[PDB]
Structures are given as structure tokens and as C-alpha cells.
Design a protein around this ligand. Structure first.
Ligand SMILES: *[C@@H]1O[C@H](CO)[C@@H](O)[C@H](O)[C@H]1NC(C)=O
Ligand SMILES: *[C@@H]1O[C@H](CO)[C@@H](O)[C@H](O)[C@H]1NC(C)=O
Ligand SMILES: *[C@@H]1O[C@H](CO)[C@@H](O)[C@H](O)[C@H]1NC(C)=O
Ligand SMILES: *[C@@H]1O[C@H](CO)[C@@H](O)[C@H](O)[C@H]1NC(C)=O
Ligand SMILES: *[C@@H]1O[C@H](CO)[C@@H](O)[C@H](O)[C@H]1NC(C)=O
Ligand SMILES: *[C@H]1O[C@H](CO)[C@@H](O)[C@H](O)[C@H]1NC(C)=O
Ligand SMILES: C[C@H](NC(=O)O)C(=O)O
Ligand SMILES: [Cl-]
Ligand SMILES: [Cl-]
Ligand SMILES: [Zn+2]
Length: 574
């Protein structure tokens, strides 16, 4: 029986590589060239890979995992018994695949038009408006418009999507889709663990919120900002108010200490998307890590096509499962924000390359959070004023606070948002939130966790969650919350390994081979062992902890408390 098991795994692996490689090709062609033809081909490939999953999944379920001796064989087979969507009857499967495609397409080609005829796409048009406009009404137009066109358009598909993904989940032994997604962490205490982590970062977030609210009150007027209430969701420089670094100009702690226009600098010296990824590639190699293959530079879509072609612009990294072909698809814009995103994606590519020799079933991160954290860890070092200056993109306590504030506007503000998304979906999946209450519960969470309010009252028919990529694209979000916490834990450990001393926020692990070695050994494990082991390999301990992130921002937390205190701020929103 143990012999049939190792043989089954070998067969599953060699056949999966081929079928998955073909699927990736079709999926890539659609993503980088949305047409009726590429869509039709993708849906056909869905049926093919599903047929393969059903065949091997059915066989896998015939094994009594309890009797299997080899742990690795045991782990792979248990995983293969989960057919995911392939567990659905042929009819429901095709309907489910079409629904996913329709939601993705609808989101990626949606536009917001003006009376004249000027229509704006999310990237880069609407994104730019949200980031640079300081006019309440213009920000509102873009904010409401996007939700009117993308969000409302997704509502007709969601209820059916929920029914079908939940059905597939139950057919694989789970109570619902949320349960299925959470299982990716193999951590029974997950919900409680995440809640405790969230609570530890509350004091810092609430102080940042109150400080930013005061600055907005200063700029937009007392008639539009309640100093004791939530903040209008369209004033944070980002379409979803998930990161607030774009309004840094409105909240600079010490305006006397000017900061170079990084974007202007990048554009000034002709930085290009290719250059941006080249720099990222250099950071990884400086650590002794792997460089992307030549094939990467030739097949990746690092810029939005002018081809008159329609594509899915949202940044993503691709593993074509042949251990050679890896690509990135991103409509990269030349600015610091996208430079960080470029590192984020290159981090995914590094993970792909690091575990490319493990059985395909184990080719994943220790847990989804780890996969999201790698790139961010390096980006933390890249973002330091000193490193940016070394790239000729930049030119002291007050400078420390200004820097920490810029970092907090992104990293801290994102904590409650990243926590909220799946708290909403898990309740949709378990039936607690019906389609009658989709939007109302989304905003109750938006208020409860982020302390935000909608600038325009929502009405029946609105489906704001649909206006956030990951919702219609059905990509789990809790991984980003985990990532933001652990990436600081990794930063802390890597810096210590690099011999750094002094304030953690001043660390730059560039060229540190000791740092790279820890990330490499951890990444090489793929999904072969419980994630606490990969956590231990990198940090010397096995748990997730907010200590590193709090330590990184300590100087800022103290400054914020003193600042908010002297202005008599009332934290929170009664
Ligand atoms: C886009 O896909 C169509 C098929 O629908 C193909 O004929 C066309 O050449 C593709 N465009 C590019 C730029 O590859
Ligand atoms: C899988 O589905 C295809 C059609 O896509 C069908 O021809 C084939 O017989 C099914 N079974 C196997 C084992 O391939
Ligand atoms: C378990 O089986 C896998 C797959 O064949 C093999 O690589 C691994 O070395 C085996 N482990 C032990 C302890 O025998
Ligand atoms: C249409 O409105 C936009 C506002 O985004 C403006 O920039 C554009 O010039 C207007 N078109 C004409 C023809 O005036
Ligand atoms: C380590 O995490 C476990 C949960 O797995 C928790 O019970 C324990 O208290 C944590 N230890 C420290 C020192 O944080
Ligand atoms: C990719 O490399 C090939 C050589 O294999 C070259 O012909 C092609 O033009 C390159 N493409 C880009 C976009 O650089
Ligand atoms: C942070 C996450 N990044 C990503 O999908 O690349 C988001 O865009 O909301
Ligand atoms: Cl929203
Ligand atoms: Cl996840
Ligand atoms: Zn990612």
C-alpha cells in the first residue's frame, strides 16, 4: 500500500506539471489579451485541468492517509484528495468557471466616464486622481464613479459565486469556502491569533488615525471632518483607503525638513518599468539569492500594453510549473509606490525559483502570508532614506519621524483594512451575511476597524466590495494581514543576522549574505512542513508576533502620543 502511494505521487507530479503548464499558458494569454477567443480557450482549459484533478483526486481519496507511513507522501496525498472546484458536477463547474471569468473581465475593463466622453480606467487614471487631487468633489467623483461602474456591475454575479464556491468547499469536506481558505494555514487557533495581533496594533493605528484626521480637518475644513468621528473614505490618497502614503504632503510631521520628489527624481533620470525590476533583481542577488532567468525579461508584461489590447492590470507573479518559465504581469507606473510593488512581485518569483524542485503539490509558501512577505521584506530596506539616496532618488530625529510617518501611512494604515476584507467574506461564506446585507455589513466593518465612513450614503444596488480587485477575482486576503505582521519579524531577524545595531528602522540588509541564507533555507521548504518551522528558521522562534512591527515604529508611536495629546485628540470614533 505504501508502494502504490509513492508511485501515485510520482505519477501525479509528472502529469500535473504538464497539465498545469498548459493551463498557465491559456490563463496568461487571457490575462494579457482579454478577448472572446482567449476567454473561450481559457474556459476549455479549465475543463481539462479539472478532468485531471478529478482523476487523480478520486484515486487519492481511495488511500487511507491514516495508514500511510511516509509523512511527505502522507501530506501530498491528503492535499490531492481536495479537488477544489473540480469536485463540482460538470454543469455547476462550467457555470462557476464562467462566473469567475465574467467577474474578472468586468472588473478589469470597467471605466468611469465624464459627460463629454473622457472615460478613465482604474490604472493609471483613477488611481492618479485619488493620489494627487486635493479637491473634495473631484475625489468624490472618482471614488463614487468607480464603485458605480465596477462595484454595482459585480453584484449580479456574487450571490451565485458564493453558492458555487461554498458547494465546492462542502464537496471537499469543509463547512464553507471560508473554512476551506482558512485551512491553508493549518492553524486551528488562526482566528484568535489574528484577532490578538490586530488588537496589539490598535494603539498605534488609532493614534495615526487621529493625527491624520486632524490634518484633513486642517485642509478640507471643519464642516467636512468630525474630529471625534470616522474619516471620509475618499480622502486618503488611495481608492480603497488601504494605504495612505499619497497624502504624506498633508500630514508631514516636520515640513521644515523637505523630502525629494522621489517620483520626479525617478522620471527625471529616466527610470523605466524594466529598470525598476532590474533594481529589484539586483537586491535579491546581492543577498546571494537567485536572479530571474533571461526568459523572464522576454516573456513578462512589465508595462500596460499600448497594443490597443485589453488586459488585467493588477500586479501578479506567475509560476508556469516547469521550473524554468516565471513571469510578472503588471501595468507598472514609474514612482516609488510601484517600485515597492515590483519588489513584492519579484519576491513571489524568488519563492517560485527556490522551491521549483519540490513535488508540485508542495510548491507553495509555508503559508500564504510567507509568499506575500518576501518581496516586502527587501522593499523595507529599499525604502530607507539612505538606500533611496544611493539610487540617487533622495538627497536626524526630524528626518526619522518624517520617514517613520511615510512608512506608517502604508504599513500601519493597511493593518485594519487587510484584517477587514476576509472578516467580511468569512461571514458571507458561512451565511451570516446575505446578499440583502452585503454592503451594509461591509461598511459596518469599514467603520469598526478602519474608522472610515462613505462620503456618499450607499443605496440599494451598491456593492462596494466588488470594487476591490480581490473580491471579484476570488483571491483570499488574510494573507496580506499576516504578511504585514511577519515581514517586520523577518526584517528584525535578518537585520540582527546582518549585524545591524541601533534603531530597527535604520536597517538596510542590502548585500547581506547571512540574511539571504535564512530566507533561502526557509523558502526551499515550500509547503513541505508546518509553517512554524519556516518561521523558526528565519526568526529563531515559531510564532507570529506584532513585537517587531511595534519595535520598528516605537519612535513614531511616542511622537504621535505626544502630538495627539497636546492637541487634545479623542482617539477612536464614539
Ligand atoms: C489578442 O488575442 C487575439 C485572439 O483573440 C489574437 O489574434 C491577437 O493577435 C492577440 N494580440 C496580441 C497583441 O497578441
Ligand atoms: C475528461 O474530460 C474529457 C473532455 O474534456 C473527456 O474526453 C475524457 O474522457 C474525460 N476523462 C479522462 C480520463 O480524460
Ligand atoms: C518519503 O517519500 C518521498 C517521495 O518518494 C521521498 O523523497 C522521501 O525521502 C521519503 N522519506 C523517507 C523518510 O523515507
Ligand atoms: C472632458 O472632461 C475631462 C475631465 O476629466 C477634461 O479633462 C476634458 O478636457 C473634457 N473634454 C473636453 C473636450 O473638453
Ligand atoms: C508561541 O505561540 C504559542 C502558540 O503556538 C503560544 O501559546 C506561546 O505563548 C507563544 N510564546 C511566546 C513566547 O510568544
Ligand atoms: C526576449 O529575448 C528574445 C531572444 O530569445 C528576443 O528576440 C526578444 O526580442 C526579447 N524581447 C524583449 C521584449 O526584450
Ligand atoms: C496589497 C495587495 N497587493 C497585491 O494584490 O499585489 C492589494 O493590492 O490590495
Ligand atoms: Cl469601499
Ligand atoms: Cl490566505
Ligand atoms: Zn503578492
Amino acid at each position: 500500500d505504501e508502494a502504490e502511494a509513492s508511485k501515485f505521487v510520482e505519477e501525479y507530479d509528472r502529469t500535473s506539471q504538464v497539465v498545469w503548464n498548459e493551463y498557465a499558458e491559456a490563463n496568461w494569454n487571457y490575462n494579457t489579451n482579454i478577448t472572446t477567443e482567449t476567454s473561450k480557450i481559457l474556459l476549455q482549459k479549465n475543463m481539462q485541468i479539472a478532468n485531471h484533478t478529478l482523476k487523480y483526486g478520486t484515486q487519492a481519496r481511495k488511500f487511507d492517509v491514516n495508514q500511510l507511513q511516509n509523512t511527505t507522501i502522507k501530506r501530498i496525498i491528503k492535499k490531492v484528495q481536495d479537488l477544489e472546484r473540480a469536485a463540482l458536477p460538470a454543469q455547476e463547474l462550467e457555470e462557476y468557471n464562467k462566473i469567475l471569468l465574467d467577474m474578472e473581465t468586468t472588473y478589469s475593463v470597467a471605466t468611469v466616464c465624464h459627460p463629454n466622453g473622457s472615460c478613465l480606467q482604474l490604472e493609471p487614471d483613477l488611481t492618479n486622481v485619488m493620489a494627487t487631487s486635493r479637491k473634495y468633489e473631484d475625489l468624490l467623483w472618482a471614488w463614487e464613479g468607480w464603485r458605480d461602474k465596477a462595484g454595482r456591475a459585480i453584484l449580479q454575479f456574487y450571490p451565485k459565486y458564493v453558492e458555487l464556491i461554498n458547494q465546492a468547499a462542502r464537496l471537499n469536506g469543509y463547512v464553507d469556502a471560508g473554512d476551506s481558505w482558512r485551512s491553508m494555514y493549518e492553524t486551528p487557533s488562526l482566528e484568535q491569533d489574528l484577532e490578538r495581533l490586530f488588537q496589539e496594533l490598535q494603539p498605534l493605528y488609532l493614534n495615526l488615525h487621529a493625527y491624520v484626521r486632524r490634518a484633513l480637518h486642517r485642509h478640507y475644513g471643519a464642516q467636512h471632518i468630525n474630529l471625534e468621528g470616522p474619516i471620509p473614505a475618499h480622502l486618503l490618497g488611495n481608492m480603497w483607503a488601504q494605504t495612505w502614503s499619497n497624502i504624506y504632503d498633508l500630514v508631514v510631521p516636520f515640513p521644515s525638513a523637505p523630502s525629494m520628489d522621489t517620483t520626479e527624481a525617478m522620471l527625471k533620470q529616466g527610470w523605466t518599468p524594466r529598470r525598476m525590476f532590474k533594481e529589484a533583481d539586483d537586491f535579491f542577488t546581492s543577498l546571494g539569492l537567485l536572479p530571474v532567468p533571461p526568459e523572464f525579461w522576454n516573456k513578462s508584461m512589465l508595462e500596460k500594453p499600448t497594443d490597443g489590447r485589453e488586459v488585467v492590470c493588477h500586479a501578479s507573479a506567475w509560476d508556469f510549473y516547469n521550473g524554468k518559465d516565471f513571469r510578472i504581469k503588471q501595468c507598472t507606473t514609474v514612482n516609488l509606490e510601484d517600485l515597492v510593488v515590483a519588489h513584492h512581485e519579484m519576491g513571489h518569483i524568488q519563492y517560485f525559483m527556490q522551491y521549483k524542485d519540490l513535488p508540485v503539490a508542495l510548491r507553495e509558501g509555508a503559508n500564504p502570508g510567507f509568499h506575500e512577505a518576501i518581496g516586502d521584506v527587501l522593499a523595507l530596506s529599499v525604502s530607507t532614506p539612505k538606500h533611496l539616496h544611493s539610487l540617487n532618488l533622495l538627497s536626524s530625529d526630524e528626518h526619522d519621524i518624517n520617514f517613520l510617518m511615510k512608512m506608517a501611512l502604508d504599513k500601519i494604515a493597511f493593518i485594519p483594512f487587510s484584517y477587514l476584507v476576509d472578516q467580511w467574506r468569512w461571514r458571507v461564506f458561512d451565511g451570516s451575511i446575505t446578499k440583502e446585507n452585503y454592503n451594509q455589513e461591509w461598511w459596518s466593518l469599514r467603520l469598526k476597524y478602519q474608522g472610515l465612513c462613505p462620503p456618499v450614503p450607499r443605496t440599494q444596488g451598491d456593492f462596494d466590495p466588488g470594487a476591490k480587485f480581490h473580491i471579484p477575482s476570488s483571491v483570499p486576503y488574510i494573507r496580506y494581514f499576516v504578511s504585514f505582521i511577519i515581514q517586520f519579524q523577518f526584517h528584525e531577524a535578518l537585520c540582527q543576522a546582518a549585524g545591524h545595531t541601533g534603531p530597527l528602522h535604520k536597517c538596510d540588509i542590502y548585500q547581506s549574505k547571512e540574511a539571504g541564507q535564512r530566507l533561502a533555507t526557509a523558502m526551499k521548504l515550500g509547503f513541505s512542513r508546518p509553517w512554524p518551522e519556516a518561521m523558526q528558521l528565519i526568526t529563531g522562534q515559531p510564532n507570529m508576533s506584532a513585537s517587531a512591527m511595534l519595535s520598528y515604529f516605537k519612535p513614531l508611536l511616542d511622537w504621535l502620543r505626544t502630538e495627539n495629546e497636546l492637541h487634545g485628540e479623542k482617539l477612536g470614533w464614539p
